[PDB]
Design a binder for this molecule. Sequence first.
Ligand SMILES: [Zn+2]
Lengths: 115, 256, 157
Amino acid sequence: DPVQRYKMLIPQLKESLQTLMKVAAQNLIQNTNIDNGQKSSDGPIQRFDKCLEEFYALCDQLELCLRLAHECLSQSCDSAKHLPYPQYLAVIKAQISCAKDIHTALLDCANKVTG
Amino acid sequence: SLLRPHFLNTPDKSPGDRLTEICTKITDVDIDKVMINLKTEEFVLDMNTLQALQQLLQWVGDFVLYLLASLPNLRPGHSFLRDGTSLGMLRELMVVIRIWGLLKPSCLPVYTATSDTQDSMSLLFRLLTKLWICCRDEGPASEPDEALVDECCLLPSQLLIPSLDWLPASDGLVSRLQPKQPLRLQFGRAPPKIDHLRRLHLGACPTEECKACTRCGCVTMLKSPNRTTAVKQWEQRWIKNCLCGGLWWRVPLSYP
Amino acid sequence: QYLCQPLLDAVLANIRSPVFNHSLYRTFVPAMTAIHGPPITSIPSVLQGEVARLDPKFLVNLDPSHCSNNGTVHLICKLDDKDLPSVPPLELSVPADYPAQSPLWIDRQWQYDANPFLQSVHRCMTSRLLQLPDKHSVTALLNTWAQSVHQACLSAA
Ligand SMILES: [Zn+2]
């Protein structure tokens, strides 16, 4: 799914970039045609700001999906790094207690040096 | 001054006075009902100067919106909320802006609206009439009712209140001085950039050179940007002085 | 280029208008300020560097004579070294804009006469001067001087 969501989001991203650049050019040309002395049709000018925030929403969806997938894959890598379910819970409480022991040993003796 | 009446109907009153009479007797909250009764074939321009008036009309609309959004709160607009005459003037300018927008839609101010089925000019005119009827009373001093307060609390939701430049950027010595203490100065040492008269946004570091008024401090660019499309009725007022009265004084460019 | 061209065409079409940055402001600042929030919260020292780094053999000092505190500068050096013999003081004329050009050795042929040994010093020194690369320093001149004195000691004995 996250790879396929990423493949979904890429052409939408290119579409939003195209519309953003073209709409920026349209709005700038309209504002220069008002600012300099020029006639110009009012028309369906299609505001710029919506395109800009739409692009930002697409980038948020992309970074969300990739951060999720990266956390999941790093999670699986360290999980493989470390068959009855009570045996699982026994080694899990063993690992948690052992890491707690290392941490409190370091903290207590780094405080035992001074203060 | 710009509206030249093409024919004299109801004579002995110039169209400034006809407009002020009509806007002061018609207290309708809608802008259409005021605009109907105002002989709108008289309010015609050549659609060139009418387009070039865009920045002054932009300042009018933005100041009205800033004032009405400032109502729920001492700030840069606190005096205008209780002055009936200035609010009447703002009403009259909104009505002539509506007429000129119907003639040519490019002259109008723009509001970034957080909706697309909106008539922003009519909204601001409704709130302005409801504020002004407070103060156009005889011997009134009517504090504004809560309906106006909540409607003007809704204005940042409906439109974006932009920002405004306020003219006296104070570098005068008289505020800085004190009795019994003399300032010791060096010559040439000198102990969001707009043109305040033609409301043009200069850049961060402006490329065209400028004059500064010596009393208020307003900045204008020195030569006009478009010599063809220039509302000379507005630009030629401030050739020799500022509006406050002080002289112009050329400011040197930065070159950063 | 691709996917960005119409912006480039609009902006390159509309350069040299005095209301340009007004147009950019009006079309771009409300979107950005809505999304991104409001904006932001005597002697040239090259010669002092050379003289400060010289070997204590040389004893470089300014000439009491000659123009001072002006374009070019003038030096009278010395030589102290038990191995080397006492020799005529040597006169240097360093131009202003000293790097990117070569200083000049003020020649005094008359004091390099009246001995065979000083004649050998002078001949060998003019030889190494012709051998020098262009835009050399002062220290290149002083070191060719010391090497010339050493060769004229060895060639003599
Ligand atoms: Zn002034």
